[PDB]
Each structure stands twice: as structure tokens, then as C-alpha cells.
UniProtKB/Swiss-Prot annotation, chain A:
Oligomer and partners: Component of the Integrator complex, composed of core subunits INTS1, INTS2, INTS3, INTS4, INTS5, INTS6, INTS7, INTS8, INTS9/RC74, INTS10, INTS11/CPSF3L, INTS12, INTS13, INTS14 and INTS15. The core complex associates with protein phosphatase 2A subunits PPP2CA and PPP2R1A, to form the Integrator-PP2A (INTAC) complex. Interacts with ESRRB, ESRRB is not a core component of the Integrator complex and this association is a bridge for the interaction with the multiprotein complex Integrator; attracts the transcriptional machinery.
Lineage, top ranks: Eukaryota, Metazoa, Chordata, Craniata, Vertebrata
Disease with which this protein is associated in UniProt: Neurodevelopmental disorder with cataracts, poor growth, and dysmorphic facies: An autosomal recessive neurodevelopmental disorder characterized by severe global developmental delay with motor impairment, cognitive delays, absent or severely limited speech, dysmorphic features, hypotonia and cataracts.
Leader sequence residues: none
Its biological purpose: Component of the integrator complex, a multiprotein complex that terminates RNA polymerase II (Pol II) transcription in the promoter-proximal region of genes.
Protein name: Integrator complex subunit 1
Superkingdom of the organism of origin: Eukaryota
Full-protein positions shown: 1461 to 1752 of 2190
Protein family: Belongs to the Integrator subunit 1 family.
Compartments, record wording: Nucleus; Nucleus membrane
Swiss-Prot record, chain B:
Subcellular location: Nucleus; Chromosome; Cytoplasm
Biological role: Component of the integrator complex, a multiprotein complex that terminates RNA polymerase II (Pol II) transcription in the promoter-proximal region of genes.
Disulphide connectivity of cysteines: none
PANTHER family: C1ORF73 PROTEIN (PTHR13322), INTEGRATOR COMPLEX SUBUNIT 7 (PTHR13322:SF2)
Pfam families (UniProt xref): INTS7_C, INTS7_HB, INTS7_N
Gene coding for it: INTS7
Keywords, sorted A to Z: Chromosome, Cytoplasm, DNA damage, Nucleus, Phosphoprotein
Family according to the record: Belongs to the Integrator subunit 7 family.
Protein name: Integrator complex subunit 7
Residues found modified as Phosphoserine: 313, 775
GO terms (BP aspect): cellular response to ionizing radiation; DNA damage checkpoint signaling; regulation of transcription elongation by RNA polymerase II; RNA polymerase II transcription initiation surveillance; snRNA 3'-end processing; snRNA processing
UniProtKB/Swiss-Prot annotation, chain C:
Its job: Component of the 26S proteasome, a multiprotein complex involved in the ATP-dependent degradation of ubiquitinated proteins. This complex plays a key role in the maintenance of protein homeostasis by removing misfolded or damaged proteins, which could impair cellular functions, and by removing proteins whose functions are no longer required. Therefore, the proteasome participates in numerous cellular processes, including cell cycle progression, apoptosis, or DNA damage repair.
GO cellular component terms, semicolon-separated: cytosol; integrator complex; nucleoplasm; proteasome complex; proteasome regulatory particle, lid subcomplex; protein-containing complex
UniProt feature coiled coil, ranges: none
Protein name: 26S proteasome complex subunit SEM1
Keyword match Transferase: no
Alphabetically ordered keywords of this record: Nucleus, Proteasome
Subcellular location: Nucleus
Tissue distribution: Expressed in limb bud, craniofacial primordia and skin.
Family affiliation: Belongs to the DSS1/SEM1 family.
Residues of the full protein shown: 36 to 67 of 70
From Swiss-Prot, chain D:
Family the UniProt entry places it in: Belongs to the Integrator subunit 2 family.
Protein name (database record): Integrator complex subunit 2
Shown residues in whole-protein numbering: 724 to 953 of 1204
Quaternary structure and partners: Component of the Integrator complex, composed of core subunits INTS1, INTS2, INTS3, INTS4, INTS5, INTS6, INTS7, INTS8, INTS9/RC74, INTS10, INTS11/CPSF3L, INTS12, INTS13, INTS14 and INTS15. The core complex associates with protein phosphatase 2A subunits PPP2CA and PPP2R1A, to form the Integrator-PP2A (INTAC) complex.
Organism per entry: Homo sapiens
Cellular compartments annotated: Nucleus; Nucleus membrane; Cytoplasm
Taxonomic superkingdom: Eukaryota
Length: 283, 901, 32, 207
């Protein structure tokens, strides 16, 4: 029976003439699945799982809404249904694979967090389809999901998608991105060494003035900020051909010029680092 | 003309032009390949060194290329220190490209200088430099030193840890520096520190690029340091399961593939459960193919036996059901992997509640077959390969399915294209070769299929006739009918290439159908456009004629035995004359001539034996003088002992001197030698001292591998002759006539089972030779080396091995036994210095030191013999047999002292 | 990836002697 | 030697590993696809970054057909606002293409980096190599394009040495001509050095 069904399915795939035999095969598969659900108990899908896979493969329909399916998927996410979520995700992916439409910019963040919370097997393709023909600011949703949602592995993909679609490190939304890089995460060093070697020099100077600026809120982590300073001093593009490790100790080669209040802010920041002392000690 | 090439190319090296120097430098690797001896290697490498020292930075890249290519000759350099100093004298220059080239040269030279400290200091100093080409060359040389040195490994562990998580040195450089951590397996705590750093890196830089590089590095560390490979297999299962990215999953696939190929015994049960479970709920198909490819490679080893180990019903196990729905999947490759898994479960461990899967297994194969027959694409061709290999293995493991197996195959031999007839004929050939009882069950059906090929296409036609007539010869285990010969003959008269008929003729000579071999060899004899090929085909024709004469025998008829033996000897002698005429200096056919000569000697031993059995009926009981051996027949059968034992020794000598044949040719030589031992034991148990036999064959006479039908019929004949010998042991008189009848029936039984010209008679796959350039002074021709007759002669034999192709295909050289001997050529004869030494080659080189004591007065004859020892342990007697001449002079003061004394 | 291990006739397993034999033997292309 | 030494094996065949595990289906990208990706009337740097980042992994022989679109579209890569990976990765792709098709690449890059038009050939570039230093004003503060220009200038200086030697050797039908060629080469290299050092000055607009 499995060999006969596999032979019939290859003919249905090859024989794309009007899909009438495809409809007959789908009806036969639905009837066989109903009979197997009604009668088959001990033989738990030894060959009926092949029929289930064929029915899932033949159910690749095209959604005609492509806007209300996000709400249906969000409702299915609260209901905690696996096959319903898989069918909804497969329907949403084919609809996005069609001609582009106007997607909502509010429910997309909730839908992405729902497929990232539960283990979704089709998360990457759905995210690629949603971010390819995106009718809105995808970087804001990606940054919000990265900063707020504490997804363990999948956030790494989100990190990739950040650098995959935001050309610089800072392009359009500076505030959320600055609080993403500097806070009071685990992906922080990669994006920070990016921003060391990614951004244009005027943008780097804008960040260096806003970072060591006068601010009593202490919105930036001192370790990341100070290491960003020390990296910007010794970028290999600055010293790309200078003779190395034969200097004069009396001579000073180059420095970075900052202002008086910049010096005061930097020294109070480094002493605020030095006053933490959770377990480090005096030495 | 060995150093003359060196002076020519170094005359090219002393030009003032960059082009001629570059031409000589890049011509050096051919000269390296032509003479591989370390005198030339050392000289040319020192010349390359002091050309590298002064150069315009483009010669340096060429010498770097030559050093990269000729890596296996690097251990032959003698003056290592001068070479490395001349190379190292460029690090202190100020051109960064020249420095980078010199660090790359150090990285290439890493094998010969593992523990040079200034090299490590230069790598560390240039490693944190600012010129990018210097940095990249430093990472290359750090990778190449870190694979061999340990102190370098720990210091560079600290340094590369700092520069990877130093947050400068951008992401491309980090990707370049993680393989430094890959090469870092030398010590336990070093490996643990590298493991912690890699775990921190993979959780700290969660990208697509760095995760792939770090995971490949981490698994090379795991496969190098076999202390916690299960931990990495575990971590790979969480990375393959809980990660949304796709390329990371693909590395997890190729990673588990490498780990299952390397160390499959460490795969635990829950690891296979996790891999199968992750293979179920995947939505993609390429990922499905990858995981089940990993499980298919895991199914061919002892991991299944660990998986199906006692202390759940194995029907409910995840692997078998996963194998079922991927065997019944739409895609061809996943079906091939699944049917491999199911076949491997069937061939493996024999628990009762798996046997039902056997049925599923066989149906799966034919289902897959009818999917992949009518497609004609290289992917479908590979699916045919995989399916037919599974068919062979499935029929091999469980013979009681096998008959069903073969009949299903014949069904798809009715309706498939010209590329599917082949390899199905090959599968039938293998199955009908080792297990013969099914072969006849085809017989005539192949006839009508062969008839269809009368009107088939032309492009793949010749190979297809070759395959069909080969499986015809294999299936005809007893004989071929005259009508079968007629239909085969008329079909290849209808259309043939001329080389196709040669392949059919040699297949028939292999299997034992020598009459069709006769006819096709006639056809070849009228053909063909060269001298020695004509003589070769004439020799093969004569051999086929003698073997048909040997097939024309009748049991219990000694007259026909003498007649047909005489016909076989005369046809073999026309054939051996043709073989001797066919021998060429370029192709010195040595196996064929010796095999045919010993076959002739075996049949003449049989002829003298049969007429000696006739002598008891052709002479008196003894004489009137004799009234415990009486008569000339006792002396004649003692001569039969001498001849048969010498013949067995000569068969052994032919076995030991080949080393380049396959298993089948060697086993056939063993069959002939065992026939000689059989007849020798049979005679020395019946007539010549029955008293001290007392054995009655106290060894096993059954449960044989039976790799060929000829082997099986040989073993049956051997067992029958030994049964006749045990029964007729000590009942009758020492001369007797049941004894002579026993020898007669033994000779008839040996000559009834025809012959098998094996693969090494026709084609040679592996060619291995040894050089052994003797250098005491190498002499010239008749000029002998002068020795002073108060000191020994330091012979200094040195050798190199030459491989024809695919280095070692069947057997691999483990050690080589050089033997030396002397001989007083003036006329024991100087046996006092027979010497033996064992050599283990490094790459190809043999270097030993031999001292030969020439003491008496005269001209002595040094002979040098080689003897290859293989991996299993069998010694093989090949070698050039090199001879050299020495003259022994005397000191005039010593001569006057001996005259005065 | 080969089905028959003792196959005498693979894609390229032909030694030199058989190579010149094939070269001088496929050219004629007729058999009586 | 720089072009051949950037071809060498770096550490562990990481590039081979990437071309094994990331370019399974890159046949969708085409030179003309990059052509309208560049020539969009807004500046959508995301899709061109997509295409070029996928173009990193290809071999140089497979990267030959994209030389036309890359070289023709270098000139757009000078406006204030281009992201830095576009410049750096076009520099990397130019370095990859420099290993296979160097002369045609250089003569095509001269005709694109010129200010905004004269179409220049290889003979004019070998006669005079200072047109390489006659590029756009914005090239002087774009580090990847200046790196390309510097490799190009060094190559054309060596080219002019070989060309003057060959033209002197052919047109004999001798010491004075040889020393005149030596003086021309010396003054030529000195002029190239002086123009480079004057590029190294800070401009008066930023001072």
C-alpha cells in the first residue's frame, strides 16, 4: 500500500494537468485518514503516517487574506495548538510568497514573539518572507524583540537579521539602538565590535560625544563603553602600516582629543566602574 | 646523469634575469620527483635556500610554492641548520611582504623544525603586527606550528585567547583565528581551556558566521581530543534541535557525519534517540536527507548493536519507524538512505521481534527500484548504486530472503533502459557468484532478454552485452548448452566492437567455459594489428584448447586420462611458446609465463603419476631377488614425492613473489598449491610409510567462506580425496591396487574441475617497485670495488619505493626486509656474512648501514634482496636482486709480514 | 560506491597492455 | 607579490568551508539583478548589501561576470551616506577580481573613477600612469577606493617601466637613450610620490 501510494503521488506531482486526479487523490487520502483514525489503534501509523505526510504535502493552499491570518495565528498561539499553528504558519508563508500586501506593524511583533516563545520549526523562512517584502520599519521590530524578549537561541538569528538588514550599526533609530548596545546581554560584544568596525567616522564621533556626555542617569554600562573607547583608540585601520614595537618611550605618537567636561564625565564613569566592587576586592 | 640536472638547473639559477631563475625554481619539483635520493634533495634544497636569501620577493614566492608542493621530501634534508638559517635570515628585513613570505615558508617547514625557539618568537612578534599580510601569514604559521609543538601551543593559546576576545581585530580576523584553537589538542588542561574558550565564544558571538567557524573548530578539537566526544555529540543535538538557523543545522549534519565516521562506538542510545526524534519533526527535506544520511553511516557500524542492546519492544523504537516513513518517502535520496538503514538493521543483530521488517525490507528495495529505473539522471544512477549495494548486502546477510531477492531483480531486468541493465547485471553477477544455487533459476530468461538486445540502442550497447554475457557465465555453474553457445555467438556476429568480444572471451576464461573462449580467441586471432598482441591472443587460444581437452574426461577411465592429458600438454606447449614470443621488455609478462609453466608442470606430474599407477600393471611385483619396499614402484613414488613437494614449493614461490594481485588470484594460487599438497599427502598416506600418519584429518572440513564456485568445487574434491585417504588407511598391503585406484580417482577429480584464469593474468591494478641504489661506490660494470682486506666494506644500501597508481590499493607496505649475502667468485662460498635488517619507511625512503667482511683473498659477489612485510604480516619476495663486484687487494707491508711469518 | 567488488570491467581499471590492446582493437570494428 | 599572496591559504580553509556551507543556492543572484539593485532611484543599500555579501563567497572565475556591474557602479559609491560594508566589500571583491583579470580590471576602473567624459585605453595608461591620480575629489577621502587607486598606480608604474623599456628596445633603428629613459622613469616615480604626498595634505575646506 505504501509503495502504491508513493507511485500515485509521483504521478500526481508530475501530472500537473488540471489537478482533477490530484483532487481525487486528496479525497481518497482524506477518506483513508478518516478510516485509519476510526479503526487503526494498535498499528499506530506504520503506513498511515505516510498518508498523513502526503496529505500535509498536498495541503499547500494559497491564503487569500494575508492580513487577518496574523490575528488567527496570534489567537492560535494563546490556545497552544501545534498542528493549527503549523497550518497557520504554512498559510502565512505562502501568502507572503505571493504578491506583496500591506502588513500591520503592530501585530507583527506579537506574532514573532509568539513563534519565538514556542518552538516553531518554520521560524526562519517566515521571518525571511516577512522581512523581505516588509511594509514598515523592520529594524524597530527586530530591536524590540532583541531587547525585550529573552529568547535563548533564536535571538542569535535575530542578531544576524539586525546586521542583515541594517546597513550601518546606527542608521535610523539611535535611541533604542544605543540602549541596546549600552544598558544598566550575551550578544552585546559582537554588535559592539561591529560598531567599532562598522560605522562611519562622523557617526562614531556622534556616539563618542553622546556616550561620555553629561548625564546623571548612568544609562550606559561602563565596561562596554570604556572598552569601546579603548578599541576606538587602537583600530587597525588607523595604524595600518606604522612600524610596530620599536617606539620611543619619551615620545608620544598620537592621542584622541576630548573636551574638559568630556574628561570629567569619563573620569567619573571610570570611578563609577571602580566603585561597584560586588566581589572583586581592592586589588 | 643524476647531478647533471642539478648543475643544469643551477646554471639556470645563476642568471641575472628573474624569469630564468623562476623557471629553474619551478622546474625543481620535477627533478625532485625523478631522483628522490637525499643527496640530490639536500643539495637542491640548500641551493633553494641561498636563492631565497637574496631575491626580489617574487623568486621567494616561487620557492614558497616549491616548498609547499614538495612537502613529503622535507624530511630527507640533511644539513637542516644551514637551510633554516638561510631561510630565517629574511625575518629581520623591513619589507613586510618578504617577512610574510618567510613566515609562510616557516609554516611549510614546520615538520622539520618543531622546537626552534626563534621561529616561535618571530611568529609571536609578527602575529600582533599591523601589516595585514604579515598578520595572515603569522596566523598560517601559528596554525602549522601549533599542530606539532606544545609550548608554542600553550603560549599561543594565551595570545590567541587575548586577540580573539580583545574586542579589536574585527570579525574577519576572529574567523581566521579560531582554527588556531582547532589545532590545540596537545595537553589535557590545554584542551579544557580551549573548550571553555570555544563555549564562551559560541555563546558570546551568536552570528551565522562565527557559530559555523567555532563549531567546526570545536568538533575538530573533539575529534582530536578523544576525552569528551559524547559531550560534543550532545551539544550538537541541542544545536541541531533548538536553533532556527539553517546553515548551522547543515554544519550540525556534516559534523555528526564526521563524528560518526570517526568514533561511532561513543554514540550512546539517547544520542541516537535524539537524532531520530530531531529527524522526525523537521519540515524541510534537505535537512531530512542530511540527518538520515548521518544515521545511514551510523547504521553500517557497531552503533546499531549498542542501540539494540538488552537492558522496550524494538518495533516501538524510534529508528525503525523513522526508517519506515523515510523508506516510503517521495524523494529518491531519502528513500535510498532509509532503505540502507532498513537493510543494515536486517543484516545486523538477530533478535526475533525484528524479523517482520525483513519482509518490509525486501519490498522496499523493489519499490525503490521501480522508482529509479526509468529516470536516466546521475542522481538516479547514484540511487541505483545505493539500492543495488543494499540488495547485495541484504541477500548476503539473510540467505533465506535471497531467492525472493533475485527473482524481483529479474522482473526489473525486463523493462528498463540501457543504463539500468548494467549494474543490475553486476548485482546479479555478485549474488550468483558467491551463492550459486539461484543462478540456474535465471538461465533461459536471460536468453530472451539478450535477444531483445539484438535491436537495442548503440551508445551503451557494448558494456551492456559485456554485463549480460558475464552474468550468463556466472549463472552457468554447471556448463553451457550448445544452443546457448549458438545464440550468444550469432548475436555477437550480428554486432560487436572487437574489444567487447575480447572482454567476453576473458570472462569465459575466468569462469571456466573454455570452448566459447576458444571460438572468440580464434576471432581475435584473425583480427588485431601488432606482433605481441597477436602472440598473446594465440597463447590464450592454445590455453583454451588445452582446457577443453581437459574438460573432455570420463570417470574411471585411465586411457582417456592419458590421451586427454597428452593433448592438454601439447596445446599448453604451443601456448607457452606463444607466451614466450609475446614477452616484451616494456611489459615483461612474468605472472602469466610462470603460472602457465607451473600448470604444465602440474599436468606432467599428473601424467607421470597416472602412468606410474599403470606401472604396477606393467611390471612385476618386484624381481626374483625380492622374496619393506619391494619393486621399482617404490622408488618411482618417492620421485613423485620429490616432484610434487618441489612443485608445491614453486607454487609458494609464485605466491610470495607477486604482491600486486588481488584476493581472488592469490586464492587460486592457494588452490593449486593445496592440490599439490593434497596429492603429496594422499600418496605418503597410502604407500610410503602408512605407519606414522595417525591423523585421519583432525581438522575442520566444513563451514567455508566459498568466495567462488571454483573454490567450492576444489574444496569438495579435497574433502572427497581426504575421505578416501582416511577410509583406506591401514587395512591393505603397502603396494595395493585400491591405492593406485585412489590416486587415479584423485587425479581425475582434480582434472574434472577445470581452471580459472584470474584477474592478475589479464589486468594489473597495483604496481609497486623498489629501487635500492647501492652506494659503496656504485662501480660501473665489470670494474670491482677495491677493498684492502683488513677492514670491512660499509655497503650503505639506500632505497625508495615507486607506486604505479592509487599508492596502495590492496595491500600496504609496513616494513621492508633487506637481506645481503656474498659469494666468492674466484674459481659455502662466503656465506659467513648473510645479513638481515628491517626498515620502516618514513614516506618512501629506506636507509640502512651494512658492513661486509671480506677476509680471504678474492673477488666477492654481493647480492641484495628485498622483502616487503605487509600490515597483516605476510612477507612478500619482490625486489631488484642487485649484484655488485668487489676485488680484495692486500697491504704490501702486510704481504711482506705474512711472507716472513 | 561500487556494487560489484570483483568487477573486471569498471570505468577505468584497464592497465597499459590492455590500453594499447583496446586502442588497436576498437578501430577495426568488424568480426567474422 | 601582494596579488599572489592574497590568494594563498590563510588559516584552515575557512573560505572553502563557507563555500561548502553557505552558497547552496546562489543562482538567483545575477549581474543584472545587482544592476537594478544599484540603479534604484532611492538608495536601498540593504538589497545591494545582500547581493554583494553573497558575492563574497564565490570563486574569482565565477566572479568574472560581475566585474562589469561592479566597475560601472563604483562611481555611485562616493556620495555622503553610503554604508561602510558596501565600500569595504566592493574593495574585497575588487581584490578578488584583481587576482584573475588585472589589466582589464584596471583599465575599466580608470574609466569609472574619473571625475564627472574621456574613455581611456591601456596604451595611454602605460604611456602616462598619472591619470590614476586624476580620479574624483571624493576618492581622496574614501579609504577603500584610495586603496584600489594605490594598487592600480603601483601596477601602472611598473607597467610604464616595462613599456618604456620595450619601446626603447624596439625603436633602435644607445647609452644616451638608455639614460634618458632612466631619467624619465626617475622623474616619473618622483612625481607620483609628490602627488601622493600632496594628497596627504589636509585640504583647505576642512581647515
Amino acid at each position: 500500500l505504501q509503495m502504491l501510494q508513493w507511485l500515485d503521488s509521483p504521478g500526481v506531482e508530475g501530472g500537473p494537468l488540471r489537478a482533477q486526479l490530484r483532487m481525487l487523490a486528496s479525497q481518497a487520502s482524506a477518506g483513508r485518514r478518516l478510516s485509519d483514525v476510526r479503526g487503526g489503534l494498535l498499528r499506530l501509523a506504520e503506513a498511515l503516517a505516510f498518508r498523513q505526510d502526503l496529505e500535509v504535502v498536498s495541503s499547500t493552499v494559497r491564503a487569500v487574506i494575508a492580513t487577518l491570518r496574523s490575528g488567527e495565528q496570534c489567537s492560535v498561539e494563546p490556545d497552544l495548538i501545534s498542528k493549527v499553528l503549523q497550518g497557520l504558519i504554512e498559510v502565512r508563508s505562502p501568502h507572503l510568497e505571493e504578491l506583496l500586501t500591506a502588513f500591520f506593524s503592530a501585530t507583527a511583533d506579537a506574532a514573532s514573539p509568539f513563534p519565538a516563545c514556542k518552538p516553531v520549526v518554520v521560524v526562519s523562512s517566515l521571518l525571511l518572507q516577512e522581512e523581505e517584502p516588509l511594509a514598515g520599519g523592520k529594524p524597530g521590530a527586530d530591536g524590540g524583540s532583541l531587547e525585550a524578549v529573552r529568547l535563548g537561541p533564536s535571538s542569535g538569528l535575530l542578531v544576524d537579521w539586525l546586521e542583515m538588514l541594517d546597513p550601518e550599526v546606527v542608521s535610523s533609530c539611535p535611541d533604542l539602538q544605543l540602549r541596546l548596545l549600552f544598558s544598566r546581554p550575551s550578544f552585546r560584544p559582537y554588535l559592539l565590535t561591529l560598531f567599532t568596525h562598522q560605522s562611519s567616522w562622523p557617526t562614531l564621533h556622534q556616539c563618542i560625544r553622546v556616550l561620555l556626555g553629561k548625564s546623571r542617569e548612568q544609562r550606559f554600562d561602563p565596561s562596554a563603553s570604556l572598552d569601546f573607547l579603548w578599541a576606538c583608540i587602537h583600530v587597525p585601520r588607523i595604524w595600518q602600516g606604522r612600524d610596530q614595537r620599536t617606539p620611543q618611550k619619551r615620545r608620544e605618537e598620537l592621542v584622541l582629543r576630548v573636551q574638559g567636561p568630556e574628561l570629567i564625565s569619563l573620569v567619573e564613569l571610570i570611578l563609577a566602574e571602580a566603585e561597584t566592587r560586588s566581589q572583586d576586592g581592592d586589588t | 646523469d643524476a647531478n647533471s640536472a642539478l648543475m643544469e638547473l643551477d646554471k639556470g639559477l645563476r642568471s641575472g634575469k628573474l624569469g630564468e631563475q623562476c623557471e629553474a625554481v619551478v622546474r625543481f619539483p620535477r627533478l625532485f620527483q625523478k631522483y628522490p635520493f637525499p643527496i640530490l634533495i639536500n643539495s637542491a634544497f640548500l641551493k633553494l635556500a641561498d636563492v631565497f636569501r637574496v631575491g626580489n620577493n617574487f623568486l621567494r614566492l616561487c620557492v614558497l610554492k616549491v616548498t609547499q608542493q614538495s612537502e613529503k621530501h622535507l624530511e630527507k634534508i640533511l644539513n637542516v641548520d644551514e637551510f633554516v638559517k638561510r631561510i630565517f635570515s629574511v625575518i629581520h628585513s623591513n619589507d613586510p611582504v618578504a617577512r610574510a613570505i618567510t613566515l609562510r615558508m616557516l609554516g611549510s617547514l614546520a615538520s622539520i623544525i618543531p622546537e626552534r625557539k626563534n621561529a616561535h618568537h618571530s611568529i609571536r612578534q609578527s602575529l600582533d603586527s599591523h601589516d595585514n599580510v604579515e598578520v595572515e601569514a603569522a596566523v598560517f604559521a601559528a596554525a602549522n606550528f601549533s599542530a606539532q609543538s606544545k609550548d608554542f601551543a600553550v603560549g599561543i593559546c594565551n595570545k590567541i585567547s587575548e586577540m580573539i576576545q580583545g574586542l579589536a581585530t574585527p570579525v574577519d580576523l576572529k574567523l581566521k583565528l579560531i582554527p588556531i584553537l582547532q589545532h590545540m589538542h596537545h595537553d589535557a588542561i590545554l584542551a579544557s581551556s580551549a573548550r571553555q574558550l570555544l563555549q564562551q565564544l559560541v555563546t558570546s558571538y551568536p552570528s551565522t558566521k562565527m557559530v559555523i567557524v567555532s563549531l567546526h573548530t570545536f568538533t575538530l578539537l573533539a575529534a582530536s581530543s578523544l576525552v569528551d566526544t559524547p559531550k560534543q555529540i550532545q551539544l550538537l543535538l541541542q544545536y541541531l534541535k533548538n536553533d532556527p538557523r539553517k546553515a548551522v543545522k547543515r554544519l550540525a549534519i556534516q559534523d555528526l557525519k564526521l563524528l560518526a565516521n570517526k568514533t561511532p562506538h561513543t554514540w550512546s542510545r539517547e544520542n541516537i534517540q535524539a537524532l531520530c526524534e530531531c529527524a522526525l519533526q523537521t519540515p524541510y527535506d534537505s535537512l531530512k536527507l542530511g540527518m538520515l544520511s548521518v544515521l545511514s553511516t551510523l547504521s553500517g557500524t557497531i552503533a546499531i548493536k549498542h542501540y539494540f542492546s538488552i537492558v522496550s519492544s524494538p518495533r516501538s523504537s524510534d529508528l525503525v519507524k523513522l526508517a519506515q516513513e523515510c523508506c516510503y518517502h517521495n524523494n529518491r535520496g531519502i528513500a535510498a538512505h532509509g532503505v540502507r538503514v532498513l537493510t543494515n538493521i536486517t543484516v545486523s543483530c538477530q533478535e526475533k521481534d525484528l524479523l517482520a521488517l525483513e519482509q518490509d525490507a525486501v519490498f522496499g528495495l523493489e519499490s525503490l527500484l521501480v522508482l529509479c529505473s526509468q529516470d536516466d539522471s546521475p542522481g538516479a544512477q547514484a540511487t541505483l548504486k545505493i539500492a543495488l549495494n543494499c540488495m547485495v548486502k541484504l541477500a548476503k546477510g539473510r540467505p533465506h530472503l535471497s531467492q525472493s531477492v533475485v527473482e524481483t531483480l529479474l522482473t526489473q531486468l525486463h523493462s528498463a533502459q540501457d543504463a539500468a541493465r548494467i549494474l543490475m547485471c553486476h548485482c546479479l553477477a555478485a549474488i550468483a557468484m558467491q551463492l550459486p544455487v539461484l543462478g540456474d533459476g535465471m538461465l533461459g530468461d536471460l536468453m530472451e532478454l539478450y535477444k531483445v538486445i539484438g535491436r537495442s540502442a548503440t551508445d551503451k550497447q557494448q558494456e551492456l552485452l559485456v554485463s549480460l554475457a558475464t552474468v550468463i557465465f556466472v549463472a552457468s555453474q554447471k556448463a553451457l548448452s550448445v544452443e546457448s553457445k549458438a545464440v550468444i555467438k550469432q548475436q555477437l556476429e550480428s554486432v560487436s566492437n572487437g574489444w567487447t568480444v575480447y572482454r567476453i572471451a576473458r570472462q569465459a576464461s575466468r569462469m571456466g567455459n573454455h570452448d566459447m573462449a576458444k571460438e572468440l580467441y580464434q576471432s581475435l586471432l584473425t583480427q588485431v594489428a601488432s606482433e605481441h598482441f597477436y602472440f598473446w591472443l594465440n597463447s590464450l587460444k592454445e590455453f583454451s584448447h588445452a582446457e577443453q581437452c581437459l574438460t573432455g574426461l570420463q570417470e574411471e577411465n585411465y586411457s582417456s586420462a592419458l590421451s586427454c592429458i597428452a593433448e592438454s600438454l601439447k596445446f599448453y606447449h604451443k601456448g607457452i611458446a606463444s607466451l614466450t614470443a609475446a614477452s616484451t621488455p616494456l611489459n615483461p609478462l612474468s605472472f602469466q609465463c610462470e603460472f602457465v609453466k607451473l600448470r604444465i608442470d602440474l599436468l606432467q606430474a599428473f601424467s607421470q603419476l597416472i602412468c606410474t599407477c599403470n606401472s604396477l600393471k606393467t611390471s612385476p611385483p618386484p624381481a626374483i631377488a625380492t622374496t619393506q619396499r619391494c619393486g621399482r614402484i617404490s622408488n618411482q613414488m618417492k620421485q613423485s614425492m620429490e616432484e610434487f613437494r618441489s612443485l608445491a614449493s614453486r607454487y609458494g614461490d609464485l605466491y610470495q613473489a607477486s604482491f600486486d594481485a588481488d584476493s581472488a588470484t592469490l586464492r587460486n594460487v592457494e588452490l593449486q598449491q593445496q592440490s599439490c599438497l593434497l596429492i603429496s599427502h594422499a600418496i605418503e598416506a597410502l604407500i610410503l610409510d602408512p605407519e606414522s600418519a595417525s591423523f585421519q584429518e583432525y581438522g575442520s572440513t566444513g563451514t567455508a567462506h566459498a568466495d567462488s564456485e571454483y573454490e567450492r568445487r576444489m574444496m569438495s574434491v579435497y574433502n572427497h580425496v581426504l575421505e578416501e585417504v582416511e577410509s583406506l588407511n591401514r587395512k591393505y598391503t603397502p603396494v595395493s591396487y585400491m591405492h593406485t585406484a585412489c590416486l587415479c580417482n584423485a587425479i581425475i577429480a582434480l582434472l574434472k574441475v577445470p581452471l580459472s584464469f584470474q584477474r592478475y593474468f589479464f589486468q594489473k591494478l597495483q604496481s609497486t617497485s623498489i629501487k635500492l641504489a647501492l652506494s659503496p661506490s656504485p662501480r660501473n660494470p665489470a670494474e670491482p670495488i677495491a677493498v684492502q682486506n683488513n677492514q670491512q666494506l660499509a655497503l650503505k644500501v639506500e632505497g625508495v619505493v615507486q607506486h604505479g597508481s592509487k599508492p596502495g590499493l590492496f595491500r600496504k607496505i609496513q616494513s621492508v626486509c633487506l637481506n645481503v649475502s656474498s659469494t666468492l667468485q674466484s674459481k659455502i662460498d662466503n656465506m659467513t656474512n648473510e645479513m638481515e635488517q628491517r626498515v620502516e619507511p618514513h614516506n618512501d625512503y629506506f636507509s640502512t648501514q651494512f658492513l661486509l667482511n671480506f677476509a680471504i683473498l678474492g673477488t666477492h659477489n654481493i647480492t641484495v634482496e628485498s622483502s616487503v612485510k605487509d600490515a597483516n604480516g605476510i612477507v612478500w619476495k619482490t625486489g631488484p636482486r642487485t649484484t655488485i663486484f668487489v676485488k680484495s687487494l692486500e697491504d704490501p707491508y702486510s704481504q711482506q709480514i705474512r711472507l716472513q711469518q | 560506491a561500487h556494487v560489484w567488488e570483483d568487477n573486471w570491467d569498471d570505468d577505468n581499471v584497464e592497465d597499459d597492455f590492455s590500453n594499447q590492446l583496446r586502442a588497436e582493437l576498437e578501430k577495426h570494428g568488424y568480426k567474422m | 607579490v601582494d596579488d599572489w599572496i592574497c590568494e594563498e591559504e590563510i588559516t584552515g580553509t575557512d573560505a572553502l568551508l563557507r563555500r561548502m556551507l553557505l552558497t547552496n543556492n546562489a543562482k538567483n543572484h545575477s549581474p543584472k539583478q545587482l544592476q537594478e539593485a544599484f540603479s534604484a532611484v532611492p538608495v536601498n543599500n540593504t538589497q545591494v548589501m545582500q547581493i554583494i555579501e553573497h558575492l563574497t563567497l564565490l570563486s574569482a572565475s565565477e566572479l568574472i561576470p560581475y566585474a562589469e556591474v561592479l566597475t560601472s557602479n563604483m562611481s555611485q559609491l562616493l556620495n555622503s551616506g553610503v554604508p561602510r560594508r558596501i565600500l569595504q566589500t566592493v574593495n574585497k571583491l575588487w581584490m578578488v577580481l584583481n587576482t584573475v583579470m588585472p589589466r582589464r580590471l584596471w583599465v575599466m576602473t580608470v574609466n569609472a573613477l574619473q571625475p564627472s567624459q574621456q574613455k581611456y585605453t591601456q596604451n595611454d595608461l602605460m604611456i602616462d600612469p598619472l591619470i590614476v591620480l586624476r580620479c574624483d575629489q571624493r576618492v581622496h577621502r574614501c579609504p577603500p577606493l584610495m586603496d584600489i587607486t594605490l594598487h592600480m598606480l603601483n601596477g601602472y608604474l611598473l607597467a610604464s617601466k616595462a613599456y618604456l623599456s620595450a619601446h626603447l628596445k624596439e625603436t633602435e633603428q644607445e647609452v644616451t637613450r638608455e639614460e634618458l629613459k632612466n631619467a624619465l622613469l626617475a622623474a616619473q616615480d618622483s612625481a607620483a610620490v609628490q602627488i601622493l604626498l600632496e594628497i596627504c595634505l589636509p585640504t583647505e575646506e576642512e581647515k
